């Protein structure tokens, strides 16, 4: 519960309906329920999980940044209190996702494609925790993101072509981690550039449709390089 009484297939079907309705909180709850059925997730289902929580946490992060900026300018308790409220709700979502990955998506992922997908997610949600972290565990949170990203990179480099869209999105996000979380902008720039160039040199192997998928993400790498250099 609360999704324990619903069929796995019905949860997946309703997740897709929620996406069409832009009801991402519903989408996430349905996909949480599907994961908790205990069966491994398909590629399409992994994408549904990621899209749902991406959008939920995306709204929370955008709200947190608005409130944090207001709080910074103000420096009564109301601004801090409400920023804390949003922050706490954000941390709860990140904890929920990390709990699904740890129980038991990652350990049951016996393919490079699935394992890399989930380790990237683990790095992303530790990164979102790091964005709001300030206390005695910020360094441990940051290292947990780095570690997850690094293991994903190691596997993706061994087992995936340089144009694979999950490998490219992983590298994009690890590069942003370096730039704005780890205060390593040169690492961030180096990774974005090497990832872009190695994908460019592999495009000749791709179909027209794979070419579109890969160049879409390559453009995000180029956008960041243009912003950072």
């Amino acid at each position: 519960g609360a999704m324990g009484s619903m069929e796995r297939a019905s949860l997946i079907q309703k997740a897709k309906l929620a996406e069409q309705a832009e009801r991402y909180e519903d989408m996430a709850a349905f996909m949480k329920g599907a994961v908790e059925k205990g069966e491994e997730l398909s590629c399409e289902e992994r994408n549904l999980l990621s899209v749902a929580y991406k959008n939920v946490v995306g709204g929370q992060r955008a709200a947190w940044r608005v409130l944090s900026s207001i709080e910074q300018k103000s420096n009564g308790p109301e601004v801090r209190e409400y920023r804390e409220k949003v922050e706490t709700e954000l941390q709860g979502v990140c904890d929920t996702v990390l709990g699904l990955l740890d129980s038991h998506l990652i350990k049951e992922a016996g393919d490079a494609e699935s394992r890399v997908f989930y380790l990237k997610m683990k790095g992303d949600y530790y990164r979102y925790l790091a964005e709001v972290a300030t206390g005695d565990d910020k360094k441990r949170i940051i290292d947990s993101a780095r570690s997850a990203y690094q293991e994903a990179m190691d596997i993706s480099k061994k087992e995936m072509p340089p144009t694979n869209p999950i490998r490219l999105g992983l590298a994009l996000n690890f590069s942003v981690f370096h730039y704005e979380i780890a205060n390593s902008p040169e690492e961030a720039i180096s990774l974005a550039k090497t990832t872009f160039d190695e994908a460019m040199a592999d495009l000749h192997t791709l179909s027209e449709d794979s070419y579109k998928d890969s160049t879409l993400i390559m453009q995000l790498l180029r956008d960041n390089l243009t912003l950072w250099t």
């Binding site: 992303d124 956008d223 960041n224």
Partner: peptide, 5 residues
Amino acid sequence: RRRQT
């Protein structure tokens, strides 16, 4: 612009 992920 904001960096992209």
